Amino acid sequence: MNPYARGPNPTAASLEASAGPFTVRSFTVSRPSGYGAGTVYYPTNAGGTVGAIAIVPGYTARQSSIKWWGPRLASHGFVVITIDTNSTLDQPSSRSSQQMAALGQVASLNGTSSSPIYGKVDTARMGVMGWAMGGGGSLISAANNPSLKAAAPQAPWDSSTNFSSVTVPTLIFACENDSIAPVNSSALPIYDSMSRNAKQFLEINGGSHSCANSGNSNQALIGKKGVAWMKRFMDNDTRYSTFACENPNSTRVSDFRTANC
Ligand SMILES: O=[N+]([O-])c1ccc(O)cc1
């Protein structure tokens, strides 16, 4: 009787696949509200309203770096907006404001009859993702908006690592050999600061700073985990509890931690 459960029962194979069960379409945002540019990905056949996820790139970067998440997540039953920031050189606090503005605009479009996502979104169920400074921005978003249902930043950085205010379920993807935002001074301290949430830390063996970006060679695992985390926590969908919470016990993972999951 979970009103938010969508799609067939998951399997490892179905979550590792390039595409989930639903057909995906996309469109460009005509007039971004409070951010630079956006692409919205959505399922055409999810069978009920779905939650929305906003995804932000890192410093200097654009939608291309994070775009693979759009179809991957949308095909499992989410509306996903990938953004460009107002400036490629925006810092994490500005990136958080823009991420939240993008979620607001998804809500606007859900109420706009000419939009392809008209009536497709449950605006009460939202999540945040992003790379590097965009990952820091996602954590700021979560700290400031505790009704967000999930966060899953990748290779995050912020000038502070104290995210003890975050009560939103948070999965941190990290990249072992990150030279930009080293794990030991960025992703791991951030993970360790969070005391009141379901949380997880998944470090990719040998990964550079771009190890969770479009074109990575761990899309099966990373995509399984991101989808599972969003499903479990955005949809309250306990079919995904093991996928969300498990240690993959994988040679592709150099460090795994989880708590309250
Ligand atoms: O953009 N970032 O991910 C950064 C920026 C500066 C820094 O010293 C470390 C990481």
Swiss-Prot record:
Q: What induces it?
A: Highly up-regulated during growth on PET film.
One Gene Ontology term, aspect cellular component? extracellular region
Q: Where does poly(ethylene terephthalate) bind?
A: 59, 133, 157
Q: State the reactions this protein catalyses.
A: (ethylene terephthalate)(n) + H2O = (ethylene terephthalate)(n-1) + 4-[(2-hydroxyethoxy)carbonyl]benzoate + H(+); (2,5-ethylene furandicarboxylate)(n) + 2 H2O = (2,5-ethylene furandicarboxylate)(n-1) + 2,5-dicarboxyfuran + ethylene glycol + 2 H(+); an acetyl ester + H2O = an aliphatic alcohol + acetate + H(+); a butanoate ester + H2O = an aliphatic alcohol + butanoate + H(+)
- Give the UniProt keywords, A-Z: Disulfide bond, Hydrolase, Secreted, Serine esterase, Signal
Query: How activity is regulated?
Result: Salts and glycerol enhance the enzymatic activity in vitro towards pNP-esters, while detergents and organic solvents reduce the enzymatic activity.
Give the temperature dependence. Optimum temperature is 40 degrees Celsius for PET film hydrolysis. Optimum temperature is 30 degrees Celsius for PET (commercial drinking bottle) hydrolysis and BHET hydrolysis. Optimum temperature is 35-45 degrees Celsius for the hydrolysis of pNP-esters. Remains active even at 65 degrees Celsius (about 60% of maximum activity).
UniProt xrefs under InterPro entries: AB_hydrolase_fold (IPR029058), FrsA_esterase (IPR050261), PET_hydrolase/cutinase-like (IPR041127)
Q: What is the effect of changing residue 213 to F?
A: Increases activity towards 1-naphthyl butyrate
State what changing residue 131 to H does. Displays increased enzymatic activity on PET bottle and on BHET. Exhibits improved PET and PEF degradation capacity relative to wild-type PETase
The record's pH note reads: Optimum pH is 9 for PET film hydrolysis. Optimum pH is 9 for PET (commercial drinking bottle) hydrolysis. Optimum pH is 6.5-8.0 for BHET hydrolysis. Optimum pH is 8.0 for the hydrolysis of pNP-esters. The enzyme is active at pH 6-10, has an optimal pH range of 7-9 and it is rapidly inactivated below pH 7.0 or above pH 9.0.
- Give me the disulphide-bonded residues: 175-211, 245-261
* Result of altering residue 131 to A: Displays decreased enzymatic activity on PET film and on BHET
The entry sums up its family as follows: Belongs to the AB hydrolase superfamily.
Function of the molecule: Involved in the degradation and assimilation of the plastic poly(ethylene terephthalate) (PET), which allows I.sakaiensis to use PET as its major energy and carbon source for growth. Likely acts synergistically with MHETase to depolymerize PET. Catalyzes the hydrolysis of PET to produce mono(2-hydroxyethyl) terephthalate (MHET) as the major product. Also depolymerizes another semiaromatic polyester, poly(ethylene-2,5-furandicarboxylate) (PEF), which is an emerging, bioderived PET replacement with improved gas barrier properties.
Q: What is this protein called?
A: Poly(ethylene terephthalate) hydrolase
**The species this protein was found in:** Piscinibacter sakaiensis (Ideonella sakaiensis)
